[PDB]
Write a protein that binds this ligand. Structure first.
Ligand code: DZC
Length: 281
């Protein structure tokens, strides 16, 4: 497909936010983008002297996010022309990634209410419903890969492993998010919408533990063994039983027995005492 062309001259970098395997990410301002063409805050990923592989990944990402359009998938504005560095422009989400957001409101850090936690979960579920409808398998769903904006707006993204020390990925070739993966994904590399559902169950666990790492008490070896042997994450004390039952529904060993994300979204909606009303006016 065609990707929107953004002129390099229209982008002004403000602050470096971090770096993954695909280049540095910046807080920036962009002109001639808004309907009023006045400058607006954006997020920019810059890829310096990209390899052939990096270039193809850049292109795959640009085409994918052009086609993937939804309220709870990270918004993509476009790319600059060919050159060095390669530049990709995103919607700016001012509260950063969801894992740090959760930890910032946690006891170890005011707090998040049940309604707020369910709203976060429901938004992610909504994004996943869209992904499933597009037959897209994410394979790395986790709160670290979600962004938070104004009014607790949450969207699904994919940043990959940090270029900053992390314990979320393990070399089982490729670095894998084993703590978020079902048995069949770890053992047989089977990635489906059903394995994404498993990962959502773990996301639920993240939310109600304020961003704590799944299986924090286990080494990577112990995690693989544990998931293989069919053990599941324990119910957080502040987690309602109905929410934990949703987690258990995501964690059926047989993938076809797991709740589908459409069912999960309906349940989470029904669980809320006063779930937010969505408007487009
Ligand atoms: C959001 C994002 C950013 C950002 C951002 C942003 C915005 N405001 C803030 C505020 N503080 C930190 C970051 N901020 C940077 C690089 C990549 C992506 C991204 O999410 N890229 C993506 C790629 C794929 N692809 C899948 C395979 N990948 C390996 C590459 C391509 C699929 C998807 C998804 F949306 F489908 F999840 C998203």
């Amino acid at each position: 497909t065609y990707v929107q062309h953004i002129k390099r001259r229209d982008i002004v970098l403000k602050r470096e936010l971090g770096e993954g395997a695909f280049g540095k990410v910046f807080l920036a301002e962009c002109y001639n983008l808004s309907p009023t063409k006045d400058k607006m805050l954006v997020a920019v990923k810059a890829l310096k002297d990209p390899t052939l592989a990096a270039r193809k990944d850049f292109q795959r990402e640009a085409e994918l996010l052009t086609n993937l359009q939804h309220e709870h998938i990270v918004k993509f504005y476009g790319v600059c022309g060919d050159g060095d560095p390669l530049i990709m422009v995103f919607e700016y989400m001012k509260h950063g990634d969801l894992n740090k957001f959760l930890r910032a409101h946690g006891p170890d850090a005011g707090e998040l209410g049940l309604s707020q936690m369910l709203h976060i979960a429901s938004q992610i579920a909504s994004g996943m419903v869209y992904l499933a409808s597009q037959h897209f398998v994410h394979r790395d769903l986790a709160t670290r890969n979600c962004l938070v904006g104004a009014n607790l707006l949450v969207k699904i993204g994919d940043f990959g492993m940090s270029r900053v020390y992390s314990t979320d990925y393990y070399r089982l070739h490729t670095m894998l998010p084993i703590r978020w993966m079902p048995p069949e994904s770890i053992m047989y590399r089977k990635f489906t919408t059903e394995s994404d559902v498993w990962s959502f169950g773990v996301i639920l666990w993240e939310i109600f533990t304020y961003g704590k790492q799944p299986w924090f008490q286990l080494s990577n070896t112990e995690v693989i063994e544990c998931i293989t042997q069919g053990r599941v994450l324990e119910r957080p004390r502040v987690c309602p039983k109905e929410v934990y039952d949703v987690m258990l529904g995501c964690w059926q060993r047989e993938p076809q027995q797991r709740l589908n994300i459409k069912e999960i979204y309906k349940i989470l909606h029904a669980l809320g005492k006063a779930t937010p009303i969505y408007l487009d006016i």
